[PDB]
Design an enzyme around this catalytic site. Sequence first.
Site, short mmCIF file in Angstrom:
data_model
loop_
_atom_site.label_atom_id
_atom_site.label_comp_id
_atom_site.label_asym_id
_atom_site.label_seq_id
_atom_site.Cartn_x
_atom_site.Cartn_y
_atom_site.Cartn_z
N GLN A 147 -27.62 3.94 -37.36
CA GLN A 147 -28.96 3.37 -37.14
C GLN A 147 -29.82 3.64 -38.38
O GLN A 147 -30.78 2.90 -38.57
CB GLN A 147 -29.55 3.99 -35.87
N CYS A 181 -32.03 3.99 -31.73
CA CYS A 181 -30.96 4.59 -30.89
C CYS A 181 -30.79 3.80 -29.58
O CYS A 181 -29.65 3.50 -29.20
CB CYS A 181 -31.23 6.06 -30.57
N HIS A 186 -33.25 11.16 -26.97
CA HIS A 186 -32.23 10.41 -27.74
C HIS A 186 -31.41 9.56 -26.78
O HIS A 186 -31.30 9.95 -25.62
CB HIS A 186 -31.38 11.39 -28.58
N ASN A 205 -22.28 8.29 -30.50
CA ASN A 205 -23.62 8.41 -31.10
C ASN A 205 -23.76 7.27 -32.12
O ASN A 205 -22.76 6.55 -32.36
CB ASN A 205 -23.83 9.78 -31.73
#
Lengths: 216, 67
Positions: free
Chosen positions: A20, A26, A163, A183
């Site tokens: 990102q 995110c 997150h 992630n």
Amino acid sequence: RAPDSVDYRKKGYVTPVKNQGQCGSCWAFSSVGALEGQLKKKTGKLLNLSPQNLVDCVSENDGCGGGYMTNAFQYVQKNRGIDSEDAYPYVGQEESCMYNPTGKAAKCRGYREIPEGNEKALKRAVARVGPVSVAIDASLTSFQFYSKGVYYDESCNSDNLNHAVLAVGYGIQKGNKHWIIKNSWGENWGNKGYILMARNKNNACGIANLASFPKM
Amino acid sequence: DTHWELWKKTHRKQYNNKVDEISRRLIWEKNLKYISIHNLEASLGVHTYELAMNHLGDMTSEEVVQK
Ligand SMILES: *[C@@H](N)N(C)N(C)C(=O)[C@H](Cc1ccccc1)NC(=O)OCc1ccccc1
Ligand SMILES: [Cl-]
Ligand SMILES: [Mg+2]
């Protein structure tokens, strides 16, 4: 007996790890991951979808200033589609919505929410539906520099969700139950961009506090 | 500063001035020490996971999640 464990990477339901960068996107990566898994399930094709499409066009969210995965799923439903990454490439900053229906690669018929704090409900959804969008406390240095093993830090705050990531399965390593988490900080973070997070440790890091998945 | 230079170059890091760069170097040094102590604790069974330096080395853990 085989263990009860699921890993959607093995079944071809997960795209490569993305980065990102500086942008607070995110939520957009988490959303496209969940949509990518349902598209694979529906049509047998694994395709990168456009986080930039979500950043520029989900007006209920704040682009690089953050947003919700549920607002993204509602936008794809209302928009009657989302573009491929190829048709709408990631530039890592917010620009004018340039959605193009010719680049459309997926649709959405709504979203489902996991009941708050219920890790068994999240497990059933991963097992029966596919990758699920999740929110966590990733605010600790122990998370910042995670490399390998099962992440379990008692200082993690289930009430501090800061997150958004993607649960792509669950299992056990050296007797420690885990979630398999994709992630969006590139392949140089974690284990090639992944973290194993403690499962059935009283909802560690709020993993089951705001989980959602798109209907297709 | 051989390792700090290689880290900056590898991760394409830039700072606005000497005070900013030294401030960032200080965060990175503190994070290297944190990593070393955590991993020593993990070798003794204290933690079920291990740490490593990455491209977020010059940042606070709050900064990573809160722009
Ligand atoms: C991540 N790159 N970034 C800036 N984050 C942390 C977010 O976008 C978070 C993700 C999230 C999802 C669910 C629960 C907790 C955290 N979302 C966020 O900050 O939303 C803020 C927002 C602004 C404007 C409109 C809606 C939400
Ligand atoms: Cl959300
Ligand atoms: Mg910290």
